[PDB]
């Protein structure tokens, strides 16, 4: 048996009311599939949310342990296995996910093989094994048939656009996704819906449409019980308040921290959001990572040094940054930091240029402010706001 | 007998070598179609340019008179009649065109009927009898069959975009014209190629792609004997040199003037282009119309006064302009004039705003130059150069 089933039987001996509890949690509408699940090997529910909700309601502290065991004992040709692939990916359980992909690609079920091949494209692109052009080419050559994978083929590009600061294509591409065409696997329809909520929220953020940003993140939170999606929802809500409400921004970062501090990756992501928050507000900053050579962390070192008039220490950090490769959104911030250090309007104009190229209407408020303080003409600033890059 | 045949026979006695002279002017190998043309009623040359060329060679002072008599006597089911329709429309011989249109729409030849109907839409659209939307809708319901009218359906729309200064959709639209599909009527193939050359030239002008602009206009000039297209080729060539070559720009405007001596509207056009030329180069301007309340004429008054430090007269003229309603491009020039009169950078940014609104990448060089002269940052200027309105 599976660890989850061993543990479900043991606690069934000591408590029988669990059967009605487990059946209502899994939405079964009568407990026959449960009994079916436990008594015979290989029996799967028809919707994956039946185990996940049960593993959440009753063994929440060992979700990973139990699902890593169950998922990797699942026949990779089944619908539950195809579901476990999305479960693993959405939770960023790459140990579960990368094993399923290998088994599904070499397997004899074509639907599983399609899921596997496109999730593999997502994994290689998000680890910079292939370029965006190669990912697109490979997806075309796949001749994708399921509505699930036609949806995810667009999700993986949207995640790549986000991470590479290339925001202009995202809105048109996200609008091509039609989740209603997914009708056989509700778990995948339901998690993909949460994905689209988080992504729309981020698209709104970068459009400087902050109220609508917060609505989509609120919809995302209400629509999910997956920790990864709660994390990025509180992060995006917090970030929408960066320039307006310091304490409410901090409160969302600390709320996201309260459910995720144990995880090293999530711990770092809220540390960085808090670090940028305190730099924008020019406060003392206990969140800087002085032991890092990532662009984000070095930029925050320089931003803080600049806020406190430590110009040579700032220049020293920016000398390091000059020798690192930047994407367009990172380079925009780089020139903004330079413009503040040198009090040089041309560097602020180069920052705007790259914020326009990345199509970031949110962070561009930083160089615009500095040009305002230096007495820039108001019609000129209005002009720069209404012109785009294309 | 039509007048042209009467006159041709009459002159054939005096100079019997005219038969051979006309044979080569009409592009015939042997003179039997010419012999056919004079002696037998109702028969046509295979290509309409044969008789157009003869009329221009030997009776150029009577072109309208002779061609109106000849065209309005054609059987409208014939290729000569469909050719005559385009000949009338290209020359703006509206009295011939309108009669051809009505007779064609009612005849039993579905090809002539289709020609009549889409030229009809072109005339109604170009006189604002109908909106663009109604014109697209009407062309849609025609389900256009011939390659000629598929081409012309696009040309009439480009003329509308041109008439309204809406340059943005023009490059996309003109790229869809494929004149190589026009194989049966070479007269229409050739005149449409002139139409496309001239439209391409004006397109390139507005893009500030000036060497290509002049190439397409020289291609237009070499391809045609139609006054309208010669006039606008010389105008566009001269305009393309406004910022580079005073003497060659003047030479092209004066050549245009020479061929439109007895066309009041064309004459005024070259007068206005020379007036603008002399204000761009800040020379004495003997082309100014001081008895005019059109925007363009008044702008040139103010431009000349500003050039010659006559700022009170200049303010008087701009006072007059303030009480007149300006469109987008006109407003761009207005702010340029105000910015130079008041020496104020802000009115130059408004000038740029409206040049960007009209997708005029040529005339925008005027405020950009003044901004540079007032010490505007070089990276700002590039930014204003690169960014687009949408």
Author numbering:
A (entry chain A), B (entry chain B): 1 to 390
Please give the exact wording used by the authors of the publication that reports this structure.
Recently, in Bacillus phages, a peptide communication system named the arbitrium system was identified that plays an essential role in lysis–lysogeny decisions during infection of Bacillus host cells. This system requires the arbitrium hexapeptide to bind to its cellular receptor AimR to regulate transcription of the lysogeny negative regulator gene aimX. AimR is composed of two domains, a N-terminal domain that is responsible for DNA binding and a C-terminal domain that specifically recognizes the arbitrium peptide. The overall structure of AimR is similar to that of RRNPP family proteins.
In our previous reported structures of apo- and peptide-bound AimR, we were unable to trace the N-terminal DBD structure due to the poor electronic densities. In this study, we reoptimized the crystals and collected new datasets for AimR with or without the peptide. Finally, we traced the density of the DBD for AimR with or without the peptide. Here, we updated the apo- and peptide-bound form structures containing the DBD, although there were only subtle differences between them. In the apo- and peptide-bound form, the AimR dimer exhibits an inverted trapezoid-like fold. The last C-terminal capping helices from two AimR molecules undergo dimerization via a network of van der Waals interactions. The distance between the two aspartic acid residues in the inner cavity, D15 of AimRA and D15 of AimRB, is approximately 125 Å in apo- or peptide-bound AimR. The low- and high-FRET efficiencies are centered at 30% and 60%, with respective populations of ~43% and ~57%. Hence, in solution, AimR alone exists in two dynamic conformational states that correspond to the open and closed conformations according to the low- and high-FRET efficiencies. In the absence of the arbitrium peptide, dimeric AimR exhibits the dynamic open and closed conformations equally, which favor peptide and DNA binding, respectively.
